[PDB]
């Protein structure tokens, strides 16, 4: 009888660590997965992406059947490290739903050190609220 | 500990994670970009930016891009302190690289700064674009027009009759030209490209020796159009044909 509440009262703080850990992150929209505009965002990092060169794809595709979403950007806020990546700011195409799209670029770091990246997508020109931005962790390139 | 209070934060914390919750402050405007243009001539134009401020930010930085036959001589800045409600500038100028066309001519310009709302220590992010003109008396040596035969196109206005030479500044012939109905637009590095119908033609076309040219041209004329009318009051906005012999 006394294993019983205490179950309840260690779970009591964790419906509140989670849900104030939960949003704390959903206003920030950490989350690769959206409602509004409706593409998840997968990244990766690649096999020819090693040494000083460096290579980052990216993946986006709809869910919906019949919506065509349609001249999104993205754009990538980063601390600035030692690295260029000389485009840093696309125009998206028009998503089909249904196909997935491969995005690339090119990471150029000069020297050794390793420090996430923040890949953001926005809507066009009104919400700079940025569903989809994905916290990329970098590996530690040489 | 405090089992009634603790119990009105999840009872709380529950309303907004039912809900969306996603930008529920009004973000309506926290920062304002405008950038202008002045009256200077080839390749270096000058030109200049603006930053507003209605709260204390951080993490700011402003990039600046255009098509890569345009570069610039000063890349992408920073902005370091927000004080409430100041404002700061940096100037730069576009170079331009012997290429041949660029494909539009307006580039633009994005910042990017962090808002610290109190859900998080740090600072969420947000980004907001600008976008400017660009002129085109950067890309500018206009020879002598050559009346030939090439590919064309047809446009038509409202109001039919406009001098050519009254759209901007004289750019060919800034010698005596004895004539108004020349229509020389020899602008890229190292082209030719006329316009035609200055007095007799109704209808507005034009040719072009290669078929490569006519974009950065056409709406060109259809702006320098639209920024003669309004000192007129006629607002016209009608012509085209034939979209299948492009």
């Given amino acids: 009888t006394a294993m019983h509440r205490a179950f309840q009262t260690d779970l009591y703080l964790l419906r509140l660590r989670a849900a104030r850990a939960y949003l704390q992150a959903l206003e920030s929209s950490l989350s690769p997965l959206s409602t509004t505009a409706r593409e998840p965002l997968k990244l990766h990092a690649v096999v020819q992406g090693l040494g000083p060169t460096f290579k980052l794809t990216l993946h986006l595709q709809n869910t919906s059947t019949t919506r065509p979403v349609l001249g999104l950007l993205v754009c990538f806020l980063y601390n600035e490290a030692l690295y260029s990546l000389p485009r840093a700011f696309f125009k998206v195409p028009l998503l089909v739903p249904g196909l997935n799209y491969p995005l690339e670029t090119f990471v150029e770091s000069l020297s050794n050190k390793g420090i996430s990246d923040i890949i953001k997508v926005l809507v066009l020109r009104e919400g700079q609220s940025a569903p989809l931005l994905s916290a990329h962790v970098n590996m530690p390139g040489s | ?134 002129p085109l008396k950067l890309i500018c040596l206009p020879g002598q027009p050559s009346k030939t035969a090439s590919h064309k196109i047809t446009i038509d206005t409202n109001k039919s009759p406009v001098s050519l030479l009254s759209l901007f500044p004289g750019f060919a012939s800034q010698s005596d030209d004895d004539q108004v109905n020349v229509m020389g637009f020899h602008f890229l590095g190292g082209a030719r490209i006329t316009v035609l119908a200055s007095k007799t033609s109704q209808r507005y076309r034009i040719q072009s020796e290669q078929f490569e040219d006519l974009w950065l041209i056409t709406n060109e004329l259809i702006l320098r159009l639209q920024e003669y009318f309004e000192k007129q009051g006629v607002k016209d906005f009608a012509c085209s044909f034939s979209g299948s012999i492009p």
């Fill in chain 2, 1 to 134: 500990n405090k089992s009634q209070g603790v119990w009105p934060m999840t009872e709380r914390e529950d309303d907004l994670n039912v809900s969306v919750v996603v930008s529920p402050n009004f973000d309506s405007v926290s920062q304002a970009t405008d950038v202008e243009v002045g009256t200077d001539l080839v390749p270096s134009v000058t030109v200049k930016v603006t930053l507003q401020n209605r709260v204390i930010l951080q993490k700011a930085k402003l990039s600046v891009y255009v098509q890569p036959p345009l570069e610039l001589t000063c890349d992408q800045f920073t902005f370091e302190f927000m004080t409430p409600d100041l404002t700061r500038t940096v100037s730069f100028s576009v170079y331009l690289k012997r290429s041949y066309t660029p494909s539009e001519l307006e580039g633009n310009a994005v910042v990017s700064y962090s808002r610290p709302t109190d859900r998080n220590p740090d600072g969420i992010p947000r980004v907001i674009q600008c976008k400017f003109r660009l």
